[PDB]
Amino acid sequence: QICRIIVVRVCRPICRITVIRVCS
């Protein structure tokens, strides 16, 4: 019905910034 976007941090190698989409 509705979707949103989020963010996280992955250390590969250094903990960088990345956005992650989702749907529910």
TrEMBL record:
Disulfide bonds join C3-C23, C11-C15. It is found in: Secreted. The modification Pyrrolidone carboxylic acid is found at Q1. Belongs to the cathelicidin family. This is LOW QUALITY PROTEIN: cathelicidin-1-like. The lineage of its organism: Eukaryota, Metazoa, Chordata, Craniata, Vertebrata. The gene is LOC102973809.
